[PDB]
Amino acid sequence: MKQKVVSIGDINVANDLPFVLFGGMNVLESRDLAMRICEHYVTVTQKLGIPYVFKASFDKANRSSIHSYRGPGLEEGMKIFQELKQTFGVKIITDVHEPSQAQPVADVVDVIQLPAFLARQTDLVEAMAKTGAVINVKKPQFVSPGQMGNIVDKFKEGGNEKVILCDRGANFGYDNLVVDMLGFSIMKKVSGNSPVIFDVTHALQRAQVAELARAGMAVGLAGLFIEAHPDPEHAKCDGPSALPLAKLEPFLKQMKAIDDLVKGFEELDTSK
């Protein structure tokens, strides 16, 4: 049993290879800000030796009001990424919500994404199936890990066969998430050992971001999917929970001494 590869460009994403960080930012507030954000990761990434992918959203179809900030917009959002790629030389992972946005973003970026809440939207997956560009299937809170196969199959059946599975904890009572650490493994199986990643800042909806991201790494994953803001305290709105920018590096050393020190272990078996 070997691991699978859904490599994006010069990058190879696989459970036995070193972890690839799909960090970044939540919503695209403004290039002035964005870029500054895309700036630290890159520096810390290259400086620490960790594959990178920048993430940012150009739209928030979901919120608690219409009289709020949708986002940069699909048309005005794609552009914004452009200016970024060239400037820094990193890929762009963003999420789609309409069968239209499908192809566009396919040209503008590298790693597209499927929102959890839509993981079971035939029409939209049969459309993302076209692009043939790497896909990220965020795992819905209300869905058992062993159900990740059907979603992966359907992607195959549509033409695309390069998919990734991101974990964001699972419902635990009302208004609460807990990350079954045994999930990741069960998820490897049903998808054909496809790439598995942990969306930590999202499994938290805190000082916990560290300790909680540490555990997931010591199990062996194809990487993380994080978010950080320069001033978390104030921008402190809702949805996920971002990281304290400055603390990016010292935090990322925590992972390597894991993502490396564990991605090079002599396969064990507490089975037989």
Add this chain to the structure above:
Amino acid sequence: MKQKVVSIGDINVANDLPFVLFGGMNVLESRDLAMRICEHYVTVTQKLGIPYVFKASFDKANRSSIHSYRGPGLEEGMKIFQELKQTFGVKIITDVHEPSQAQPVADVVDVIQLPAFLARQTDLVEAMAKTGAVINVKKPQFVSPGQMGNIVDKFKEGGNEKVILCDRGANFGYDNLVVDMLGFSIMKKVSGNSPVIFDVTHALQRAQVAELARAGMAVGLAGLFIEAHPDPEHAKCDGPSALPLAKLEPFLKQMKAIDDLVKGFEELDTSK
């Protein structure tokens, strides 16, 4: 504290009024079948004295494969309802999945609906907001009842102020649903005592359909939302779980001796 009314035509839906059945069928297989289905309810309804609304889907955006039956289609689906209304004189409740389908169905039917998985899709709610036609907000399995206000507010903010809340149990471990009977009440509150209904066949994903629908009724609801098939055993596919048609009537007597015998109780208070 009085109850609210989101009456559809000659029908009044409210927590203190008798229960209104939003029964029907899942997907629209064929008028030959549909109608036969729409036939028994109507007979049993009128014969037993229970308000009625027929439900049927014209599309299943969600499934486990593209190489399967989407459904009658929006354009070819709406028509099918037409032929029904006149023939029997009952309203039509169906669900939408696209901001387009919004207005169309608004003319063709009476009770439109919001799928759970989309309960938090701004754009699509701001669109359903237009129609101004009664709305049904299926409560997502992964969402606490006290969160039903924001969804109800947003509907107001968009213009529509006639909304209903349907309950379908809440996640309990992996691959399992349990219906918090205390939900219904908590749901009345946050929405401004809006109409609350139980989607039983869906809270089950069995001989349990009865016993489980009984409990919900003895708490006092603005009604149920059921489904039945003439040959459940064979058509035994997945998604919800339908009822055994024939058993419609004797089953519905179970509710009345509740929906009535409890909808006429001297308000109690185990509070003070």
Add this chain to the structure above:
Amino acid sequence: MKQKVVSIGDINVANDLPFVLFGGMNVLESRDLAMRICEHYVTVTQKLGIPYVFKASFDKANRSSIHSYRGPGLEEGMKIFQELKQTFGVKIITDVHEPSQAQPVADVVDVIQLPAFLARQTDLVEAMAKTGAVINVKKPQFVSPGQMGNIVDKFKEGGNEKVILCDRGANFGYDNLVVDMLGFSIMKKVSGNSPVIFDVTHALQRAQVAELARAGMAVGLAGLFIEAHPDPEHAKCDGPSALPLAKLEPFLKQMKAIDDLVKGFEELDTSK
């Protein structure tokens, strides 16, 4: 398939027979109080026509401090019941925590009981097995209903074969209970259709006591197990949640129009 009977004296407890209330009080504060409590039930019981059993604890092995009120004590507690039986002519259901208390209480009362937390204490069940006096197995929050057989078997194997199963909801996240209404049925099965009862005030750990106890009754049970205090608001300590004494009667009319109106239904089957 017929129901089983674990009748205590002139009382017959069974799922198809009318519900038997095992109400009463939590801890035995004082006869002056106790009795007053035992007074209203009895009056309302006889006045409404509902079998009765009074419940009260003579010890609270579990609490949040040693420097607190253990309880009347086993030796000084048993006596207290005596004075009650004669005065009112109702049985006494109390819980045990030691293999010693086993036999004593067996002579002093009618319905002994097994605490949930101990449902799996061999030695203590093999001891309660002796008494041969009716037993009540409170169902632990952390145990699936289908596991209630083993506990019932062991009771048989020990000699006793008259056991009852009380339901108190099941863990739902941290610090929260939800009552799977489908539990009761699943519990009937594995125990050999033994008697099933709902411990409502305990499934709540409120104005909810009513609405929540209504649901359970409309499913058909061998009765309830409640608690009420004359001044809930103040005595408002913790553990279960008692009922507002005065409100006993008007509340109990709610049940009959259910426990009766449903205990006389023409067996249905949404199965075939």
Add this chain to the structure above:
Amino acid sequence: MKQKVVSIGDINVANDLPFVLFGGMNVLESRDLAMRICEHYVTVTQKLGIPYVFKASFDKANRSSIHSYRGPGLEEGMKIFQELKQTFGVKIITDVHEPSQAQPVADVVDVIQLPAFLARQTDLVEAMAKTGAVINVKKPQFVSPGQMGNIVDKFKEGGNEKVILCDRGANFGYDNLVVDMLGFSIMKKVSGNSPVIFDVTHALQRAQVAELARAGMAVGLAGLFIEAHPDPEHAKCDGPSALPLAKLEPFLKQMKAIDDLVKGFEELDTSK
């Protein structure tokens, strides 16, 4: 904020110190076997440089039948440990179920223990309070981590102030456990930073023993609490889930490269 120490003899148990393994075996089948078990740990422990404590039960008050193996017995069980201590020079951690067994075991062993199911048994804790010998509070599946203070307080109030908290996952639906990795931290707090340990073989009720024990270590704990059997496959009965003896060492290297490589990290803060 410094960590606390509840050191047993020449051993110091604390969250910031290296992890201490409280491994061993479940029930005491026989010295012939026991010892052989106590043999590998010791060898691997000393050989790998990891503090050790051997665990084994001398009684199983809980089971699924009386006509089964209780265990060596308290009187005949204590003795068995004796012969072990001298032979190998390691401490003995065993669990108690009666206020009597309290003091005895206090002389015979080093680390006594509180069973989860009894974590809230006043009388028995007020008794374990006497011994003044280190205590292990297994955290009940049905109890939130933030509730671990009251249990720790009561232990203080009784005289003993050297307590440890062992985590064994928390209920997740029916018949299932999931380990909230964020638990450990929350548990440190409420107990006064007391010692926290993970009971992995018990959080599993498999090949998962490894991956799952890895996560817990990368969060930083005062150690583990494991169990292994020479022939797991056959002795494959129930209760916890043991480890494959032989695989003890290569498995324990997994922990050190964590328990060490993380117990020597520059305190981070994703907080501010």
